[PDB]
């Protein structure tokens, strides 16, 4: 990244790295200045084509996926892969999934 | 001949018994075929079509892919190749082997083909000895009329 580069998970520049969470990423990234190259004198080796961010910001939501809109043990996610589920074999086989979404844990 | 193979393939063959001259479908009599009569007709057919093949002939067989190139970009040469053309199915080459280079096998291949294969109507059947000629200037002869006739074409 710009400033002091790291990609997930690191922190300076694109405020944070993967697993930072709802706040400090969003809050962090919101938090930075206009400048370019702060805290750093060099670019990403790959280039800045890869700043290893959305990968951390996406894996952040997977970490936030655990307790939001439901306690976790509560009735979330509602419809309850499986935004609305799928059906496997008529049984008599006993295992494997034939509908894109076999199930989504309700938690 | 085809009956003689004897066509293995199913029992429904092509017509070959029916012609057209101008309009007027002409239906030949299909009745008997005799061994000896078909043999000689087959014997001399087979025999002559062989002698029409020479060394220079292979130089011509090179041109089949070239013909079908013309099959398709000229309206003639398109017509030339009959729809039921084996040649069309024959495409679905010099071979070096030139004996000193001064023979002219093309020319010699034409002469050879022209003699034996060119003259097949004549050997299979009796050649014309007469040709219609009308002095009065009537330019056809109706069926049943008398055709003024003059020596060989």
């Amino acid at each position: 990244m710009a400033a002091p580069q790291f990609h997930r998970p690191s922190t300076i520049t694109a405020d944070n790295v993967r697993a930072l969470g709802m706040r400090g990423l969003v809050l962090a990234t919101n938090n930075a200045q206009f400048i370019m190259d702060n805290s750093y004198p060099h670019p990403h080796g790959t280039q800045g084509a890869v700043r290893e961010f959305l990968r951390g910001q996406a894996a952040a939501l997977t970490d936030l996926g655990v307790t939001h809109a439901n306690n976790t043990f509560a009735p979330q996610p509602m419809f309850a892969a499986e935004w609305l589920r799928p059906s496997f074999g008529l049984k008599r086989t006993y295992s494997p999934f034939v509908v894109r979404d076999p199930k989504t844990p309700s938690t | 001949i085809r009956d003689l193979n004897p066509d293995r393939t199913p029992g429904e063959l092509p017509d070959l018994n029916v012609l057209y001259y101008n309009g007027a479908r002409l239906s030949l009599v299909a009745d008997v075929q005799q061994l000896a009569s078909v043999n000689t007709e087959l014997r001399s057919l087979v025999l002559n079509m062989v002698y029409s093949i020479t060394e220079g002939t292979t130089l011509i067989l090179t041109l089949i892919p070239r013909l079908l190139a013309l099959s398709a970009q000229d309206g003639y040469v398109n017509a030339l190749l009959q729809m039921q053309s084996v040649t069309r199915e024959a495409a679905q080459a010099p071979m070096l082997m030139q004996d000193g280079e001064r023979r002219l096998p093309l020319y010699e291949a034409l002469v050879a083909w022209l003699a034996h294969a060119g003259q097949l109507g004549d050997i299979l059947a009796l050649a014309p000895a007469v040709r219609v000629c009308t002095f009065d200037g009537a330019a056809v002869v109706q069926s049943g009329d008398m055709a003024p006739v003059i020596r060989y074409p």
Binding site: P75, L90, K91, F97 | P10
Partner: protein, 540 residues
């Protein structure tokens, strides 16, 4: 063709058998695209020379082959032969235009019953529905067209009907006539009258057509045992039986006729035979003795082997509902199918029904309480309430708890049945004495309204297989999308209704191609088309 082995691959056994001499050539019955003065011109009707008599079809088949035999004809020299056009609907559309043929539906239609514009919007919506929930095919197959099981599940049904009615305004089970005849009989109590009418009017219309035969029939004795209306109209003729027959009552009467030849049913033995009932100990799902279950009876103690259960008009209304109405409603897009029952029950009774807490009320809403079987807590892969959910159908615990009747009644397989018959005495003479009319039908079948291949939840063709019986029912998108479908036939199957001759062929059927094209091509209404199509079924 002779049916061969299991009915499941019988169509797959067809496409592969019929791929070289099917896709290559051009089917003879393309005269549907022709106008007149196109048929009468020397050119490209080159089959004109074979249009000779009103009442017969002259076509080129193979020569020596006795028809009901073989997978594919050992093609020899082609011969040329006649088969008696059964109904007058079979005359080609070029010689009896749709635009004529529909003008005398309006003639018969005036003065008689008319389905309301409401009942047509609901019934048509069902056949046109992609999202039609799969539970209804299962329940229909679970009920297996029996009156006992219907009243058993009766409350499960009205929760399915109403929920579907509230989600999408359409009638639910219209793909089955029996159900619709029960939905009116028993369920008349609990249903909003808006959707009760759709069933009440749909059933009242089958009878309005049924009596139209009696107006145009004069009195007279019985001829060859058949009545006069059977010698007149096809829906009265009992020789022909509907494409989907839940019992043996149909074959009961047709087995005994001077006309009946021999039902050729593919199973262990060519000659059929009956089964009184079925249970968990009796059932053998994969078997081939050539046997049929006779069990639709409402009364478990009174069974039948010989004597048929229902009246004669029972079968007549199914003939009139399936052949007269459905063609009118779908417009040729729908397909029969068989059932894998081993696979059905397995996900029919696989269920998570919450044990009630002490003193706790029956949960109404699946959204809130976990003690309701449709709450996300109880939703499991492979189970049945996941299937009630995929379909947004609201059902409570006890209703799907009554599903346990499936132990007491079941079906092993669907039995694809080909039966022939002669022209009726009254229409039989020495030239036509040897003419057979080969008409097949499924034993326990289901009519699949709108194809739903587009969704990966259910594996392609799990519970059901296409097996089009009659050319009236072959979905262009049902057959093309069968699991192994030759890619060479993708387009050829768009125009041509592929029906395996194991189930009967166009020329040898009672309802031939011009009736099929009339149904989908006609621009008339649903009522008018119903009579015009009803009037094409009179005999020649």
């Amino acid at each position: 063709a002779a049916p061969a082995g299991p009915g499941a691959d019988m169509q797959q056994r067809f496409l592969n058998a019929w791929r070289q001499r099917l896709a290559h050539g051009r089917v003879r019955w393309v005269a549907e695209c022709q106008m007149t003065a196109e048929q009468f011109m020397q050119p490209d009707n080159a089959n004109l020379a074979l249009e000779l008599h009103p009442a017969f079809d002259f076509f080129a088949g193979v020569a020596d082959v006795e028809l009901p035999g073989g997978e594919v004809p050992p093609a020899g020299p082609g011969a040329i032969q006649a088969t008696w056009r059964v109904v007058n609907g079979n005359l080609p559309l070029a010689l009896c235009p749709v635009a004529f043929r529909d003008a005398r539906g309006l003639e018969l239609g005036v003065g008689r019953h008319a389905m309301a514009p409401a009942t047509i919007a609901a019934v048509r919506g069902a056949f046109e529905d992609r999202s039609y929930p799969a539970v209804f095919y299962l329940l229909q197959a679970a009920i297996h067209g029996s009156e006992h099981v219907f009243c058993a599940l009766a409350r499960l049904v009205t929760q399915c009907i109403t929920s579907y009615w509230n989600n999408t305004r359409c009638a639910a089970f219209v793909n089955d006539y029996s159900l619709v005849s029960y939905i009116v009989t028993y369920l008349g109590g609990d249903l909003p009258e808006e959707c009760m009418a759709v069933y009440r009017d749909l059933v009242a219309h089958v009878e309005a057509l049924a009596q139209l035969v009696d107006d145009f029939t004069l009195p007279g004795p019985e001829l060859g045992g058949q009545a006069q209306a059977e010698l007149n109209h096809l829906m009265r003729d009992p020789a022909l039986l509907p494409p989907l027959v839940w019992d043996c009552d149909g074959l009961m009467r047709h087995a005994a006729l001077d006309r009946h030849r021999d039902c050729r049913i593919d199973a262990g033995g060519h000659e059929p035979v009956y089964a009184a009932a079925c249970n968990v100990a009796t059932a053998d799902f994969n078997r081939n003795d050539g046997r049929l279950l006779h069990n639709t009876q409402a009364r478990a103690a009174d069974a039948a082997d010989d004597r048929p259960h229902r009246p004669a008009d029972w079968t007549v209304h199914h003939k009139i509902y399936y052949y007269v109405l459905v063609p009118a409603f779908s417009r040729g897009r729908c397909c029969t199918a068989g059932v894998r029952f081993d696979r059905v029950y397995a996900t029919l009774q696989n269920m998570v029904v919450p044990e009630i807490a002490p003193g706790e009320e029956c949960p109404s809403d699946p959204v809130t309480d976990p003690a309701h079987p449709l709450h996300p807590a109880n939703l499991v892969a492979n189970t049945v309430n996941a299937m009630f959910h995929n379909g947004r159908v609201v059902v409570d615990g006890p209703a799907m708890l009554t599903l346990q009747v499936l132990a007491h009644n079941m079906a092993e397989r669907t039995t694809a049945l080909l039966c022939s018959a002669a022209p009726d005495a009254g229409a039989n003479t020495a030239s036509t004495a040897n003419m057979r009319i080969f008409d097949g039908a499924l034993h326990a079948g289901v009519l699949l309204m709108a194809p739903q291949h587009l969704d990966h939840t259910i594996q392609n063709g799990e519970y059901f297989y296409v097996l089009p019986v009659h050319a009236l029912f072959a979905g262009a998108d049902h057959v093309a999308n069968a699991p192994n479908f030759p890619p060479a036939l993708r387009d050829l199957a768009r125009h041509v209704p592929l029906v395996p001759p194991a189930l009967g062929a166009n020329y040898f059927s009672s309802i031939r191609q011009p009736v099929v094209q009339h149904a989908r091509e006609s621009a008339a209404g649903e009522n008018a088309l119903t009579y015009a199509l009803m009037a094409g079924y009179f005999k020649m």
